[model samples]
Target: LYFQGMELLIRTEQLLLQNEKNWELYLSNREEEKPFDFYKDMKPFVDEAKRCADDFLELAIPWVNTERPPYLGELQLRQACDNVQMTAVSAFNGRSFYKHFLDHYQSTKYTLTRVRDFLKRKEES
Candidate 1:
């Protein structure tokens, strides 16, 4: 069960990082395309990330501390989803959008790593 959760976490982290890389690639071609246009392309990633968060919670929440989750709480996971969803269509300039995404991506990655580690420990014991 938790092994599956750990796998999901790893996949989620990779997806989050890949999104950041996608943003960079998008930025590289900003001269030819409008930032708004990329929204459609990125929608799938946002949905997938949200789904992974939901799935991870289903598997891990039962084992989490009652008052706190060791890493990414359900609330935090939702927040990460919201952040990515919002940023995908944010009206801000490209630089600011990239910065915001980088911030969210790093934090989400950190949380995923922590949660993965927690699951690893659980698997061992």
Candidate 2:
């Protein structure tokens, strides 16, 4: 199943969307009432995001190593890996530290969309 084209990328996109919604929902609660548990709450989210990063790196390695015309999205994909690494760090800093986490999430999302479009164009060519 992992060999299926674009399957991992699509799954990562869906997971990011879900994580975005969940983050927003949890953040919507009143500050005083909200309990932030790094292990119980944030660990799973970070782990999932990290996994997505790892999966993308796995997918990209072959693509990068192959000889092909220059694709602008390649650099962005590398940066996405860095952003995701930062994501894990920010996620663990707890609730009030979410500013950078959200930024990283958005960065990764945009990179995914760009790469998806790139692949789509190539697929049709």
Candidate 3:
């Protein structure tokens, strides 16, 4: 948390709580696996990254062009989200998937945070 949230990210502390739940299915499937698996430090980092991306959807969905409008910012980022999520779900090797997932997740998280900070402050105001 050094610079981020103590139990979550700083700016999104409240919002990220909502995001954390996005991992519930894995958290559930994580089951008794906490002590023995990648979740140690590896898992939480990955999960947090993924959660950031997944939850940020709430902000971006509305801006999506239903009529396939040509654009860069929204259109491109949405495409990135879709591709990452597909790989996150479809990768066969759980371990390898998560390792790579971190990169995609990190990129997504970065975008999510920027969007949350820039576009979606509307939610807070």
Candidate maximizing lDDT? 2
Better of 2 and 3 by lDDT: 2
Q: Write down the TM-score of every candidate.
A: 0.55, 0.60, 0.38
lDDT of 3: 0.44
lDDT of 1 at 22: 46
lDDT by residue (tens digit), candidate 2, 35-96: 56888876776677677667766766556556232554467777876776565545444453
Model 1 lDDT per residue over 76-102, tens place: 655655555554443223544556666
After superposition, candidate 1 runs with Cα above 4 Å error: 1-42, 65-72, 87-96
TM match of model 1 to true structure? 0.55
Error of 2 at 30 (Å): 9.3
The lDDT of each candidate is 0.55, 0.59, 0.44
lDDT of 1: 0.55
Give the true-structure RMSD of model 1: 4.3
Q: How close is candidate 3 to the true structure, as a TM-score?
A: 0.38
**Which ten residues in a row are the worst by lDDT in model 3?**
1-10
**Worst 10 contiguous positions by lDDT, candidate 2:** 25-34
